A and B are shown apart, each in its own frame.
Chain A
Amino acid sequence: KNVTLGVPRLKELINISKKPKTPSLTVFLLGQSARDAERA
């Protein structure tokens, strides 16, 4: 997976826009799914 980083990412952060280059989420699991691949 590729995520925008470096100078362009800093530029986005200081130039906040409704559409980043690579919008993404980091989702964490709290139940058995976290430790179970299938339930995940």
Chain B
Amino acid sequence: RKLRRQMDIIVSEVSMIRDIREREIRIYTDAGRICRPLLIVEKQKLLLKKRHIDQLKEREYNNYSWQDLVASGVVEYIDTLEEETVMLAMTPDDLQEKEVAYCSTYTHCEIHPSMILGVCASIIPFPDHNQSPRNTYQSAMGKQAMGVYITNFHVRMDTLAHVLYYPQKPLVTTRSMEYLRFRELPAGINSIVAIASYTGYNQEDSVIMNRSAVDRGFFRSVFYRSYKEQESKKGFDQEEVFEKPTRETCQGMRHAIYDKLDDDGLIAPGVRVSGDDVIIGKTVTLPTKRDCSTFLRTSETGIVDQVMVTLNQEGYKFCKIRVRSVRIPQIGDKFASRHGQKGTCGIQYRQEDMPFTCEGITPDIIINPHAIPSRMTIGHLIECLQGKVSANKGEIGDATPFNDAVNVQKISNLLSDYGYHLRGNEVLYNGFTGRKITSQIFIGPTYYQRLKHMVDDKIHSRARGPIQILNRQPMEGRSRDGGLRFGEMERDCQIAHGAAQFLRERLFEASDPYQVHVCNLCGIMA
């Protein structure tokens, strides 16, 4: 242990385990062992001293760093096997202080318990106040939350990219976000959320959004979609070339207008493109020249953002075209808090219809009260209260999970100091009538996220559309009109209903109707 802590003959990652009962000493040096740093405790005292803390405070312009701690032997790496034999102290101020002797042989002390969390779980404020599956759900949602995925997103040309116009760093933040760089690239906006049952359009995990706020850019985004097309001269006489074809030169073409394309067969930037529009005009020489041009998604309606032409790894000319489409929030768009509170925008009300406080503050978002009880996401309410206090005080709130310095009573007193109800409640006035609402609504700033799931990308319909070759059954063509699968469960449901005619309609007439001539004498047709 002395050698490892001095880094003389034993490297830091080497793990030494003494099974005293089994009279064994196992020393492990192979890769793949998961280990974490822990402060060393000797004689119920940390080896980490104020001198070390000051040298770290002056981390730069003095060359002092974490490696110096490791070399000094104040903090050492422990793997799971060695951690079996370690006597951890959760905190030095409490567990190894002279008190009721629960244990006086502590060997290490946790640097900070919150370091047990991951990247996505570290952005949850007050996660120790939420029911754990909601922490898991927020961990899942944070990966789908919009924001600025990378600073140099303009140069990049990804197949799909979502960029929020006005990302904001949370008013209530965890200290781990400083190292996640969530402040530099936020994913979400602070919204004045009021937990009320206003008109019933926020029921069942639904949300009512402020139409005026949406008009003011609230939760607006870009959707960049990149299409890559390569021209390949592979084949004896089968060559592909970028060019705007003609309705007569090619073997066959389409009613779609090709006027958008340029002389090189590529659509210029800044041109609005909707469905049934050609962005890349390609022609493949027939073994005339068949039209091999490419179209867009019918639902998609954006502007050609950037058109680049280059040679791929194969040396063939190819073009990447980035189309930009602006996504404003609308009914059906999904927003989620940082506590597993996921819901769709049920309806959008103007600032007039939205309820207002005595100060004229209307909630940007209204969520149903019933979302809170069953989920037991008390962290959401605490985040709302702390965000209110932070907005009034001008200081970003701290929501580090295991912090005894911050609690609901202290936050309530701080809020009381700013002329507000200590529990975050406000007297709200009905927007339609102006009458005071009998119950006092809980309203405050909460950090919400716009998930990538937009109703625009999910809406699709099929009505007498294209069919495939053999089955003669529906298949999506030039759109999202591939139809819906009438599965065995739906068949059984209609059987139970007894709607024989409707079941027959959905399974034959709608799928692949067909008639054949058959001989009565011998059943085989001819």
Q: Per the CB under 8 Å rule, do A and B touch in the complex?
A: no
Q: Which residues of B contact A (CB under 8 A)?
A: none
